[PDB]
Design a protein. Structure first.
Lengths: 52, 42
């Protein structure tokens, strides 16, 4: 589902008026829900999100 | 006394900034029951 969203859009060329900008998007990679604490990247559970 | 989640270890950290447990990255603390004499009705 995410590849069809990130692949059906066409980025227009950034022309303010040489030097112009053109950005693009590649493959979609979704990670797992972790916890960005002070020790390390801990395992994040759905009841940890419910209690905190 | 405050036993933490995901690991069996008491903390007893009654401070205004200490909210997590020692040697454990989680921050969920359960209050431990103190053996006091309470009464109920049957
Ligand atoms: Zn702990």
């Amino acid at each position: 589902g995410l590849q069809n969203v990130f692949q059906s859009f066409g980025e227009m060329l950034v022309e303010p008026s040489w030097r112009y900008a053109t950005v693009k998007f590649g493959e979609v990679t979704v990670e797992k829900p972790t916890f960005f604490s002070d020790d390390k990247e801990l395992e994040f559970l759905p009841w940890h999100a419910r209690l905190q | 006394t405050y036993v933490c989640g995901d690991c069996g270890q008491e903390n007893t950290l009654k401070s205004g900034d200490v909210i997590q447990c020692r040697e454990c990255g989680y921050r969920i603390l359960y209050k431990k029951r103190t053996r006091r004499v309470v009464q109920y009705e049957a």
